[PDB]
Design an enzyme around this catalytic site. Structure first.
Site: not given
Ligand SMILES: CC(=O)c1cccc(CC(=O)N2CCC[C@H]2C(=O)Nc2cccc(Br)n2)c1
Length: 217
Positions: A41, A85, A170
């Site tokens: 994702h 994933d 991620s």
């Molecule tokens: C692994 C886990 O605990 C977790 C928790 C919540 C949310 C997620 C999802 C996640 O991260 N994504 C979804 C795909 C893009 C990426 C992301 O949103 N990237 C991002 C955004 C803002 C700032 C930063 Br730095 N990176 C993972």
């Protein structure tokens, strides 16, 4: 990374920042000269991969951004599920290798890591619950959980007691005895709460798929 420490510049030479329109989005793991493994994702037009980096902004002799040539999600991945994933990214050219840019061997033998084993998760994900994006790579050591406490054979769990992976980590690696075992899930989850463990895709479960992609191109 929550509850972790600053990583030592370039000590994790497999570590990749997977970037979308210039900004960091996901971790990634250099697994061959021209292939970074991340999570599915991490995709959602212009994708790039920064290798050889500690700081995302600051000048470093080893830092090299790369264009991505092909994006191969696992065929069985779904946008709304945490299964399958994985994502493989073929770079524009083969990476300039050095002490600071080096592929990480991944587990090809399908045995679980022993529960209690502390493994190392690194990333540029958020460092607090206000959303703070660090400039420099962070890491945290996390104990692995048995399967039944996890509750898929294809997933593995780590303790999340303050110390934890989070948003933006991620697709980056979970490393145990110097071998890649896990890729951080790219689905939303609460971070830092010991009752909701971290989830990481067991790469050993996908040795056939990975090979079949790394045969080609
Ligand atoms: C692994 C886990 O605990 C977790 C928790 C919540 C949310 C997620 C999802 C996640 O991260 N994504 C979804 C795909 C893009 C990426 C992301 O949103 N990237 C991002 C955004 C803002 C700032 C930063 Br730095 N990176 C993972």
């Amino acid at each position: 990374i929550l509850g972790g420490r600053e990583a030592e510049a370039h000590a994790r030479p497999y570590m990749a920042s997977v970037q979308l329109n210039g900004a960091h989005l996901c971790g990634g793991v250099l697994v061959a000269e021209q292939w970074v493994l991340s999570a599915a994702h991490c995709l959602e037009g212009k994708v790039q991969v920064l290798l050889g980096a500690h700081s995302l902004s600051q000048p470093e002799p080893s830092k090299r951004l790369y264009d991505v040539l092909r994006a191969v999600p696992h065929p069985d991945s779904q946008p709304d599920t945490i299964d399958h994933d994985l994502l493989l990214l073929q770079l524009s050219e083969k990476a300039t290798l050095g002490p600071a840019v080096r592929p990480l061997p991944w587990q090809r033998v399908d045995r679980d890591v022993a529960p209690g084993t502390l493994c190392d998760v690194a990333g540029w994900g958020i460092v607090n619950h206000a959303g703070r994006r660090p400039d420099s790579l962070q890491h945290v050591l996390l104990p692995v959980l048995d399967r039944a406490t996890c509750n898929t054979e294809r997933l593995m769990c780590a303790e999340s007691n303050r110390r934890d992976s989070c948003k933006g980590d991620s697709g980056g690696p979970l490393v145990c005895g110097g071998v890649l075992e896990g890729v951080v899930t790219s689905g939303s989850r609460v971070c830092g709460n010991r009752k909701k463990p971290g989830i990481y895709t067991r790469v050993a479960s996908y040795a056939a798929w990975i090979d079949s992609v790394l045969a080609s191109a």
